[PDB]
Amino acid sequence: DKICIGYHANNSTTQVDTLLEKNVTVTHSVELLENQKEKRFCKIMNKAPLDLKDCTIEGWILGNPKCDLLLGDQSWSYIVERPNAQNGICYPGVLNELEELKAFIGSGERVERFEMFPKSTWAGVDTSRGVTNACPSYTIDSSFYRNLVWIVKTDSATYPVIKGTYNNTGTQPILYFWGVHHPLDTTVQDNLYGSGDKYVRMGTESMNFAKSPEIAARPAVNGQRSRIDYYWSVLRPGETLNVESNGNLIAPWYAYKFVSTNKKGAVFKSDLPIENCDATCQTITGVLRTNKTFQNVSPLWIGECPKYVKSESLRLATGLRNVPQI
Amino acid sequence: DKICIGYHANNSTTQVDTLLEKNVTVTHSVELLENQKEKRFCKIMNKAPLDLKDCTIEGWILGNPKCDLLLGDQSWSYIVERPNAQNGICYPGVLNELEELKAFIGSGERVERFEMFPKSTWAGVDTSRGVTNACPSYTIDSSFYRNLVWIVKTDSATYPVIKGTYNNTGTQPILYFWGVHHPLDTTVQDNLYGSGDKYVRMGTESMNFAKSPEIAARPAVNGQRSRIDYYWSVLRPGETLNVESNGNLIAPWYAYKFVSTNKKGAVFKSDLPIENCDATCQTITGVLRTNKTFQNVSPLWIGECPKYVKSESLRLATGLRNVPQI
Amino acid sequence: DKICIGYHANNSTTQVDTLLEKNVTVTHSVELLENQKEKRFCKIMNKAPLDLKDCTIEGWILGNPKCDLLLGDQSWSYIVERPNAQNGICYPGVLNELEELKAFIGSGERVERFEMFPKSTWAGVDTSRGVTNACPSYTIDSSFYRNLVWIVKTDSATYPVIKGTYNNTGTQPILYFWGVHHPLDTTVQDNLYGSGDKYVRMGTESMNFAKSPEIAARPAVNGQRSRIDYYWSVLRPGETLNVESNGNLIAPWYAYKFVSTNKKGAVFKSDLPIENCDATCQTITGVLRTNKTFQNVSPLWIGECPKYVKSESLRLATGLRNVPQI
Amino acid sequence: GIFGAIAGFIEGGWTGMIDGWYGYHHENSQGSGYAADRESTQKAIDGITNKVNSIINKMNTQFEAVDHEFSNLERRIGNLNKRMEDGFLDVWTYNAELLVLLENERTLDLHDANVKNLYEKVKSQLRDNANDLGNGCFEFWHKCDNECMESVKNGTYDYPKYQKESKLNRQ
Amino acid sequence: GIFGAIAGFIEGGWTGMIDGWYGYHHENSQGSGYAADRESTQKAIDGITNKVNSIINKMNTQFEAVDHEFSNLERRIGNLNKRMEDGFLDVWTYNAELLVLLENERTLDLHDANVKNLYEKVKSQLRDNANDLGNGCFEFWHKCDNECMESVKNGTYDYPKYQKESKLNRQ
Amino acid sequence: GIFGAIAGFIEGGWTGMIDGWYGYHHENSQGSGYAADRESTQKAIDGITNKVNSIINKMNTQFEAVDHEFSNLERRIGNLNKRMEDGFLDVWTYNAELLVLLENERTLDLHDANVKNLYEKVKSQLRDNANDLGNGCFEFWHKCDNECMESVKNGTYDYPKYQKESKLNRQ
Ligand SMILES: *[C@@H]1O[C@H](CO)[C@@H](O[C@@H]2O[C@H](CO)[C@@H](O[C@@H]3O[C@H](CO[C@H]4O[C@H](CO)[C@@H](O)[C@H](O)[C@@H]4O)[C@@H](O)[C@H](O[C@H]4O[C@H](CO)[C@@H](O)[C@H](O)[C@@H]4O)[C@@H]3O)[C@H](O)[C@H]2NC(C)=O)[C@H](O[C@H]2O[C@@H](C)[C@@H](O)[C@@H](O)[C@@H]2O)[C@H]1NC(C)=O
Ligand SMILES: *[C@@H]1O[C@H](CO)[C@@H](O[C@@H]2O[C@H](CO)[C@@H](O[C@@H]3O[C@H](CO[C@H]4O[C@H](CO)[C@@H](O)[C@H](O)[C@@H]4O)[C@@H](O)[C@H](O[C@H]4O[C@H](CO)[C@@H](O)[C@H](O)[C@@H]4O)[C@@H]3O)[C@H](O)[C@H]2NC(C)=O)[C@H](O[C@H]2O[C@@H](C)[C@@H](O)[C@@H](O)[C@@H]2O)[C@H]1NC(C)=O
Ligand SMILES: *[C@@H]1O[C@H](CO)[C@@H](O[C@@H]2O[C@H](CO)[C@@H](O[C@@H]3O[C@H](CO[C@H]4O[C@H](CO)[C@@H](O)[C@H](O)[C@@H]4O)[C@@H](O)[C@H](O[C@H]4O[C@H](CO)[C@@H](O)[C@H](O)[C@@H]4O)[C@@H]3O)[C@H](O)[C@H]2NC(C)=O)[C@H](O[C@H]2O[C@@H](C)[C@@H](O)[C@@H](O)[C@@H]2O)[C@H]1NC(C)=O
Ligand SMILES: *[C@@H]1O[C@H](CO)[C@@H](O)[C@H](O)[C@H]1NC(C)=O
Ligand SMILES: *[C@@H]1O[C@H](CO)[C@@H](O)[C@H](O)[C@H]1NC(C)=O
Ligand SMILES: *[C@@H]1O[C@H](CO)[C@@H](O)[C@H](O)[C@H]1NC(C)=O
Ligand SMILES: *[C@@H]1O[C@H](CO)[C@@H](O)[C@H](O)[C@H]1NC(C)=O
Ligand SMILES: *[C@@H]1O[C@H](CO)[C@@H](O)[C@H](O)[C@H]1NC(C)=O
Ligand SMILES: *[C@@H]1O[C@H](CO)[C@@H](O)[C@H](O)[C@H]1NC(C)=O
Ligand SMILES: *[C@@H]1O[C@H](CO)[C@@H](O)[C@H](O)[C@H]1NC(C)=O
Ligand SMILES: *[C@@H]1O[C@H](CO)[C@@H](O)[C@H](O)[C@H]1NC(C)=O
Ligand SMILES: *[C@@H]1O[C@H](CO)[C@@H](O)[C@H](O)[C@H]1NC(C)=O
Ligand SMILES: *[C@@H]1O[C@H](CO)[C@@H](O)[C@H](O)[C@H]1NC(C)=O
Ligand SMILES: *[C@@H]1O[C@H](CO)[C@@H](O)[C@H](O)[C@H]1NC(C)=O
Ligand SMILES: *[C@@H]1O[C@H](CO)[C@@H](O)[C@H](O)[C@H]1NC(C)=O
């Protein structure tokens, strides 16, 4: 008659590591790290991402004539920008504070396009001719940004002082754009805007802006040796913008009602496909469907995701050392 | 005849958590986290804070006419700024590098106000009329910053080139301010400063400054559609400042001898009361009197404070598991 | 007849600390922290550092006439700058984006000096007289930066529009410099560059630059009350630079083919000697030859170094408690 | 092992005992069988589960890298952001990996101790009424039926009841 | 428990013993009383105190958040500062909370082991001159007066002195 | 000690035993000598070595401070960089120092447990054929020659072989 004391064994070959020993086979264990992803973009909280497709961020909110697909109101859980996207700034020049602009846009979930300054606003000048073959539409060879108006003189006259004003009476901030043209030579300057010192000055309660044309011949880009200095700003609720220029003004035409997001914002630069699907965790390199605590897919994500680490595996022993007999 | 081996028990109901078990009652334990605060500001190393009261940082060091209470020499262990403080920049405009200025001031413990450029310095022009109803004093309707001089032309004349210089022969850096006025129209420009291209140029061994007036009509703030561009700089010991302008100059009048602090600097934005009391640890949300290692009151503080964590409680077991009988 | 069970003891006096006990003598232990250094600079991967000696970074790549020792091609594993180095910017003025320039240079391992714009490039003006006693050579009293050309008018004439262009057809980025002169008075302006509004304008596919002279009398530095605004930029492979000015131009003459480093870059500011020696780990305060995991010498280093901590000692027990008898 | 039971004086585990981590194997006239000790197994399950849940809860925050961009003249703040993000990545990778190695060592020791303590619990009741074979097995000096066996497992074994019978058979 | 003594084969603690963490309860002709083992209690107090002081010393640095402000065109560096400050906050909160849970488990085990070792220390001296009841109590086979008791507590118990008396009474 | 062996019931170490961490000292007609237990010593060496290598591997990343400079108008990002670099410095200094203190405590306990388990391993084979002196020493009730000794050390000691001889001499 006998009684023996002992412990569980099974057919597990799953191993763990300890400070004292590597490759210890244990009867029970749990993997805390997730290495699997769905290589695609899905909806986040049943809200679809915004695919910019062949347009870049600049091309999209500036209203590049080939980005009419995106033109107008948008809502997004996050933004997907394609790496080889061709439609950005078409007429050569610098969009100033570009990185801050991208950070701002990323912090939003919705934009509403409206007309901020109708062409009627600019009294003694021509709004008809602001086109260039540097900025072709799909159907026509020479066009311009949908949100801007390139203003030149009436057929025969001298460029006068033009003025415009917008009072923001709504509850949302307004993202708007404008520009200053810099002709390659004094001839083009005199041709388009006439003669004399020219200025573009804009101001609000919290902002002042003043720029003069800087004339010089720079290397040709998209067939243009001239340049435009693009600018952006945000008109706060209750604030008023005053526009004053006697020439060289790329005027604000359409702007955006901007809805800032409560959550974390994201802009993913990726070639991955956007499919019809839901997700709670969206990584730049794919979707994670897991309850695991750790993840080694990517540190860049939106939604509720596991913690990113460099580890290949994080397996906790729960059972004991597996010593099956014989 | 018997002897038994055993362990301490008592009437403790204090509990701890372990990796293996929650709510374990132990005979002895120590709480390492401090959650209690005195909701007030006290002195730090027997040095009192500076209450800006109804004035903001800008209003204080610019010398806003309603901040005369603060005007002159100050010493502080830290700075308290009230959230609803009304007296800032009275005449509309931007104080440039505002955030860097705030960071600099915060790193100080004392300022000494002195006259850097007496009005005698500006030879052929009028220092009498630099007032505005945008900047009212308490007793009078139209005044100006105590540290600046708004310079306009003598009653009938043309604005000449004015010059001023200050050699810093002391052992302390000097915080000083100046400005450039931007009239809303050419009329006000011609009225105040006369006609012709105007400039404000300033320079030291390590600094160059050059600005021209930018004339345009911006939205009315404090009854003004004009603007001033405020600037600040620090004149190092041994350095000399040269002032040169033919108009639109808001000139430096009074400046500050600046004493940088050895310790950590702080600017608290709070409504909490400053009382007659001492403290070794001052949090933005109150005073901590504790020897505990951890604290969950606030990450923002000055003096010797416990480490901030998000935890509600950090209690270490010192005694053993409490198992009282029966 | 007896058998006893027991444990090792020896003559070790080496001690460790534990959570429960300090100064525990153990039979065997390992020190993980390295506190020893060779106070000198050695080669890293058999590549020697660059000693700037009596020249600063500015003096070196601007081509200060007293830095001819450094002039030309350089390769380096890292850069050593001496604290009291006297040869920097000789003609007073600000090198703009100095900190970004230093960060960029640090990320390189090699520069190749070539002539970017020969003096022949500037047609109707004089390249002969660009010298100053503010910038003495070793052998002559009045010289100028080897990489720049101070351009003034021909003996009797008016300063015309000069133009230059460089197409970067190579596979490497090009670091180049230029400047804008700011005379102390209108007399010097008219003397050197003649009369009329002057400009310096430069542009590439990705860069625009425009500056006008700002005339004012600033404190004398190296016998000069005038100033030069120095600038730098990087011409990417495939990009073209266009130079256009009607005066006040300090023109780019020589530039650098820039090789960016794969590894981590370093600029050490130190008085330590560079000797003939190799190292795998180079600290700003010396060389570390060790296989130890931790180090308390310095957080600033290049090559493969141990982790920096504040600890005096990190000794792990390996053996057991040493209890020798009697 | 630290407590010397698992892979110790008890050389191996029982594949035959599938209902618990720790337990018994008995032999008597009614045959032989495996039985898990329900109390010690459940105590271990609750503890280990608490440990796992506690580790998961402490790891329940995330450091978030950003997609923010930096221009050519923002190399410094750009590199500042990179070193920071890599910095916390290295810290948390360290925290996770070290914690797993440490806890795995301690978890296995926990099981070892539980087996040892269960053995001690039985040894204590049986006293000299049984023979300790050194391999975790006890040979009774008396007939131990199913209820006698069960009394050992649940701690109510009656030593005086079987004393003289064991006494006679032992000596 | 890991060492099986506290809330183990010694089911509960003694509220009657107020002068130490570990100790004894004796019974003889002069009556009964509690007495703390001074050596083991003091060793534990020094160790636990050293642990607390060590934890406090390692936590003796502070990460300092700043009141610095950022403009509308400084969203990136502003958010960089926030993520950093929150980053170290999460690290230290983790460090503190995990350390407390780990050390509490280990502290309690320490006490458990000390009780077990004290028991073993007494069992070793007494040998067969006493009867082990299994609950941490020993019944002497001989008369053990106050000095006999004290000799057990301080480790100088004389086994041969009481051997034959115990021998006679036992068998 | 936690397992009560090192500086415990075995009061001190043996300077005479130089070939291992744990082992034996025997006495018989052929004289006396020290011998290391090769199995337990090697198991400990492998474990401790694994621990050291594991700690070294987890510490195998470095946070890199930079020599980057900041102007007078970059006080904020300058101070941001400093607090970050000091931040990770404090974290890693904490990580290293705490880990060393924790592991040292645990390493010493490991050795303590190994000595205890080795003692238990011998006690188990010898049974009543030897007398336990309480100091880690066993006095045989029978003549134990060199091969008898070696059988104890390597676990093959034959209890029935020496039983009656021990039986006679004991009683
Ligand atoms: C740990 O494990 C033991 C072993 O299984 C268990 O003890 C047994 O418990 C069962 C049920 O409680 C007992 O069965 C009853 O026994 C009584 C006693 O009569 C006999 O007593 C002894 C037993 O050795 C014999 O020598 C006598 O000659 C008798 O045969 C018996 O009267 C009764 O029969 C009537 O009662 C029933 C209600 O219980 C009724 O429904 C039925 O119709 C009958 O009219 C049962 O046959 C069994 O005898 C126990 N064995 C021993 C050796 O004592 C433990 O369960 C108890 O243990 C006590 C100490 C407590 O802890 C309680 O939890 C249980 O009552 C078990 N304990 C635990 C905690 O799991
Ligand atoms: C651990 O606890 C034990 C028990 O209390 C303690 O041993 C006792 O110590 C006291 C004081 O040292 C002893 O009292 C003296 O005893 C001597 C011996 O005479 C008797 O011896 C035995 C005792 O069993 C009897 O059989 C004899 O018939 C005698 O009665 C006695 O001469 C003496 O009286 C004179 O000496 C005094 C100076 O000590 C003097 O002041 C006085 O006026 C008298 O002229 C004392 O009465 C007591 O006998 C001890 N008990 C036993 C059983 O031995 C341990 O203290 C000692 O232990 C030794 C081993 C060392 O460790 C020392 O620390 C102590 O001296 C105690 N040890 C520890 C470490 O705490
Ligand atoms: C643990 O340590 C023990 C003690 O040293 C060791 O056991 C001894 O092993 C050696 C070599 O294997 C034995 O030596 C041979 O013994 C045989 C048996 O004859 C005698 O048997 C008993 C011993 O007590 C006596 O009572 C008899 O009267 C005999 O004298 C003997 O025939 C032989 O001589 C011939 O064989 C040689 C080949 O081995 C040959 O080369 C030679 O020329 C001779 O013709 C040896 O003299 C010794 O007897 C053992 N001692 C005892 C008490 O048994 C263990 O080594 C073995 O243990 C077994 C259990 C396994 O684990 C194997 O590893 C070993 O074979 C040692 N074990 C370990 C694991 O280290
Ligand atoms: C263990 O046995 C089961 C039998 O149901 C089966 O899953 C397989 O044969 C084994 N599993 C593993 C993971 O080895
Ligand atoms: C041991 O460790 C490594 C890591 O997986 C590998 O070489 C091997 O598959 C592991 N298992 C065994 C049984 O060797
Ligand atoms: C630079 O040279 C390349 C050589 O093929 C030429 O294609 C390119 O047009 C040139 N760039 C300019 C701006 O002329
Ligand atoms: C995670 O999911 C798996 C599979 O559904 C499940 O077995 C496990 O219990 C889950 N873990 C938790 C903590 O809920
Ligand atoms: C324990 O008893 C004391 C009696 O002096 C008293 O503080 C109270 O009744 C109890 N304290 C706690 C904390 O339970
Ligand atoms: C158990 O844990 C939580 C945390 O305080 C709470 O519900 C309760 O008060 C604790 N104590 C008891 C005895 O449940
Ligand atoms: C904007 O409209 C509101 C409407 O009440 C008015 O009060 C405010 O004065 C307007 N702003 C300007 C600058 O006219
Ligand atoms: C902290 O203060 C309390 C109350 O004064 C005191 O009991 C405790 O011992 C102190 N802790 C230390 C480490 O001094
Ligand atoms: C130990 O003894 C050796 C003898 O060879 C010698 O190194 C010295 O006397 C002692 N070493 C130390 C470190 O104490
Ligand atoms: C004990 O600790 C400190 C640290 O080194 C020192 O005072 C002393 O040298 C150490 N050793 C001894 C034996 O006191
Ligand atoms: C400032 O005063 C000192 C006094 O010795 C003098 O040496 C220095 O030249 C002065 N600076 C200027 C710019 O005149
Ligand atoms: C480090 O170097 C020392 C001296 O050469 C050597 O004893 C030690 O084993 C080395 N450590 C490792 C991990 O190789």
Per-residue H/E/C for chain C: CEEEEEEECCCCCCEECCCCCCCEEECCEEECEECCCECCEEEECCECCEECCCECHHHHHHCCCCCCCCCCCEECCCEEECCCCCECCCCCEEECCHHHHHHHHHCEEEEEEEECCCHHHCCCCECCCCCECCCCCCCCCCECCCCEEECECCCCCCCCCEEEEEECCCCCCEEEEEEEEECCCHHHHHHHHCCCCCCEEEECCCCEEEECCCCCCCCCECCECCEEEEEEEEECCCCEEEEEECCCEEEECEEEEEEECCCCCCEEECCCCEEEEEECEEECCEECCCCCCEECCCCCEEECCCEECCCCCCEEECCCECCCCC
Enumerate residues 88 to 147 of chain E having a beta carbon within 8 A of any beta carbon in chain A: none
**Whether C94 contacts chain F with CB within 8 A:** no
Q: Where do we find the tokens 């029970």?
A: A28
Would you state the structure tokens that stand for residue A124, as one six-digit string? 């003694």
The answer to whether D87 contacts F58, with C-beta atoms less than 8 Å apart, is no
Q: In what side-by-side order are the strands of the sheet with A301-303?
A: A286-287, A281-283, A301-303
Task: Give the CA distances from residue E28 to residues B2, E145, E163, E167, in Å, rounded to whole numbers and listed in that order.
Answer: 7, 6, 18, 19
Which of C17, C18, C20, C321 is the best mutation test for E, with the most CBs of E within 10 A? C20
Nearest residue (CA) to ligand 13, atom 12: C23
| Pocket (CB within 6 angstroms of ligand 2) | E 147, 150-151, 154, 156
Best mutation target among A180, A208, A246 (most B Cβ atoms within 10 Å) is A208
Domain E1-171: CATH architecture, name and number where available: Alpha-Beta Complex (3.90)
A:13-72 residues touching chain F, CB 8 A cutoff: 19-22
Nearest to A59 by CA among A50, A71, A48, A49: A71
Cα distance between the two ends of chain A: 23
Instruction: Give CA angle at C85 (C82, C87), nearest 5°.
Output: 140
**How far is residue B35's CA from residue B292's CA, in Å, rounded to a whole number?**
10
Backbone angles phi, psi at A48, to 5 degrees: -80, 150
Q: Which ligand number lies closest to the CA of residue A23?
A: 5
Distance CA A194, CA A161 (A): 12
* B186: its two tokens: 């050419």
Backbone angles phi, psi at B305, to 5 degrees: -120, 155
Distance CA F90, CA E88 (A): 10
| Chains with 3 or more CB pairs under 8 A to chain B | A, C, D, E, F
Nearest ligand 6 atom, CA A219: 13
**E146, B3 in Cβ contact below 8 A?**
no
Helix, strand or coil, per DSSP, at residue A120 = helix
Using DSSP bridges, classify how beta strands E130-132 and E31-36 pair: parallel, antiparallel or unpaired. unpaired
Alpha-carbon dihedral B36, B38, B42, B44, rounded to 10 degrees = -10
Helix (H) or strand (E) holding F126: helix F75-126
Ligand 9 binding pocket includes B23 (Cβ within 6 Å) = yes
Would you say F142 and C8 are in contact if contact means Cβ atoms under 8 Å apart? Answer: no
Q: Based on C-alpha coordinates, what's the Rg of chain C?
A: 29
**In angstroms, how far is CA A175 from the centroid of its own chain?**
13
Pairwise CA distance, residues A321 & D4, whole Å: 13
| CA C242 – CA C201 distance, rounded (Å) | 8
Residues 55-84 of E with CB under 8 A from A: 72-76, 79
Question: How many angstroms separate the Cα of B168 from the Cα of each of A261, B147, B243, E82, F167?
Answer: 51, 18, 14, 39, 105
Sequence ranges of chain C with CATH classification 2.10.77.10: 1-41+276-326
The resolution of the experimental structure, rounded to one decimal in Å, is 2.5
Structure solved via: X-ray
Residue of C166, C134, C183 whose CA lies nearest to C253:
C166
Residue F99 DSSP code: H
In chain A, which residue's Cα lies nearest the Cα of F55?
A: A19
Tell me the C-alpha distance between D138 and D141, whole Å: 10
The two three-digit tokens of residue A182, written as one number: 């810099």
Decide: F79 and B107 in contact? Cβ < 8 Å: no
CA E11 to chain CA centroid, Å, is 16
CATH code assigned to A42-275: 3.90.209.20
Displacement of CA A221 from its chain's centroid (Å) = 24
Instruction: Give CATH 3.90.209.20 domain extents, chain C.
Output: 42-275
Q: Are F54 and A19 inside 8 Å of each other by CB? A: yes
Q: What CA–CA distance (Å, rounded) separates B63 from B50?
A: 15
* Residue B143: how many other CB atoms lie within 10 Å: 20
Integer Cα distance of F62 and F92 in angstroms: 9
Which of the listed residues A14, A15, A314 should we mutate to test ligand 5's pocket, taking the one with most ligand atoms within 8 A of CB?
Answer: A15
Q: Give, using CA atoms, the residue closest to atom 4 of ligand 14.
A: B169
List the residue whose alpha carbon is closest to atom 3 of ligand 5.
Answer: A23
Between β-strands B79-81 and B50-51, what pairing exists: parallel, antiparallel or unpaired? parallel
Neighbours of C260 (CB within 10 A): 12
Residue A111: strand pairing partners: A74, A258
CA distance B40 to B277: 9
Residue boundaries of the structural domains of chain E? 1-171
How is domain C1-41+276-326 classified at the CATH fold level? Hemagglutinin; Chain A, domain 2 (2.10.77)
Residues C41/C268, Cβ–Cβ less than 8 Å:
yes
User: Which residue owns the Cα nearest ligand 13 atom 11?
Assistant: C23
- Which residues, at least 6 apart from C267, have a Cβ–Cβ distance to it below 8 Å? C57, C78, C79, C80, C81, C102, C105, C106, F67
